[PDB]
């Protein structure tokens, strides 16, 4: 048993939802809670103290701050800021002191201050940055790691002390053409980067400093199955705690692919694929790495599934209900 006791978010943005559940060691949840947003709710991240769910709405654009109930990760409404465009995309530094927000529509990534975990007045905004889709701060807390699905880039920023963002040398980091560079996790080892790319349904596996001091592209990996000729559109990437699994969904073939990681992270294979909730723009492991909840953009349920074996395949355990539209899930151990 992992022994955890854990929460599970989901947002469901066309009937403007937030879903709470509580996540036993035995893989069950039981709903905790229904919350209705003052619009569609897309991106949502944990603070690192435990104490916030941030969380980005349209149309009226903004980072809302819902405090967490410790007890059962219930939440309450306790503040916002204006963001410069739709939130697609919502984290935080390492330390909790700023929340970034990647806004595709606006091609633009912002830096919105905490005070006492509430969200202040945005400080900074970096436009230019097409088809902008998420801020990734780098396992030393130095660089945000910004993919610019339209680009075929991801652009590299240094993060000041007080929250600036300013290009470093190199700029970025390019894939190939059509690509479209969209979410990233990186290795718990913090030495290597993992981007699934939109638009082609690939997976870069990128060193963050080689012999050179260099970042480089290592590895590239289709996520599909070889028999597969329809529309590539991936979407979600997570990497167990363990480094053991790594997974991707595609929304049109509504699979995840499970790939194992090296040991020291550097090369990914494809294990298999899981057939999963219809249109999959939105999934998560759990605190333990024993658990994948997915969300379903066209079934409106999420599915829990156990992470088995050497080869980290899925096995579903449960369905349940959430609103319409669901594609975001995270999930907080308390
Ligand atoms: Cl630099
Ligand atoms: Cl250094």
């Known amino acids: 048993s992992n022994a955890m006791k854990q929460t599970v978010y989901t947002a469901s943005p066309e009937s403007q939802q937030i879903h709470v559940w509580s996540l036993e060691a035995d893989g069950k949840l039981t709903l905790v809670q229904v919350v209705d947003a003052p619009g569609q709710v897309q991106p949502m991240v944990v603070s690192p103290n435990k104490e916030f769910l941030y969380v980005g709405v349209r149309p009226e654009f903004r980072v809302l701050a819902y405090r967490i109930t410790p007890d059962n990760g219930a ?4 503040g916002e ?3 410069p465009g739709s939130p697609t995309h919502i984290s935080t530094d390492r330390h909790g002191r700023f929340v970034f927000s990647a806004s595709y529509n606006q091609g633009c990534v912002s830096v919105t201050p905490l005070h006492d975990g509430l969200p202040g007045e945005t400080i900074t905004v970096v436009e230019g940055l097409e088809g902008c889709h998420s801020a990734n701060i780098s396992p030393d807390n130095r660089t945000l790691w910004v993919p610019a699905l339209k680009q075929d880039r991801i652009c590299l920023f240094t993060l000041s002390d007080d929250g600036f963002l300013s290009a470093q040398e190199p700029a ?4 190939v053409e059509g690509a479209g560079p969209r979410h990233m996790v990186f290795h718990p080892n913090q030495q290597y980067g993992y981007c699934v790319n939109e638009l082609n349904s690939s997976i ?3 060193e963050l400093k080689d012999p050179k001091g260099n970042i480089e592209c290592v590895q590239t990996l289709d996520m599909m199955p070889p028999d597969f000729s329809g529309v590539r559109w991936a979407a979600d990437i997570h990497i167990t705690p363990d480094g053991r699994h790594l997974y991707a969904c595609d929304r049109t073939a509504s699979i995840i692919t499970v ?11 494809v294990e298999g694929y899981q057939p999963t909730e219809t249109q999959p723009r939105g999934f998560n492991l759990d605190h333990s790495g024993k658990y994948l909840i997915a ?4 079934s409106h349920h999420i599915a829990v599934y156990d992470i088995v074996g050497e080869q980290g395949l899925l096995q579903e355990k449960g369905r349940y209900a959430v609103g319409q539209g669901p594609m975001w899930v995270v999930v907080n151990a308390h």
Do not use: N, P, R
């Open 204 to 206: 870069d596996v990128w």
């Open 172 to 175: 970025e980091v390019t894939t």
């Open 81 to 83: 800021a204006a963001l």
């Open 259 to 269: 790939f194992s990681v090296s040991e020291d992270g550097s090369v990914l294979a």
């Open 295 to 298: 969300a379903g953009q066209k």
């Open 75 to 78: 939440l309450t409404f306790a």
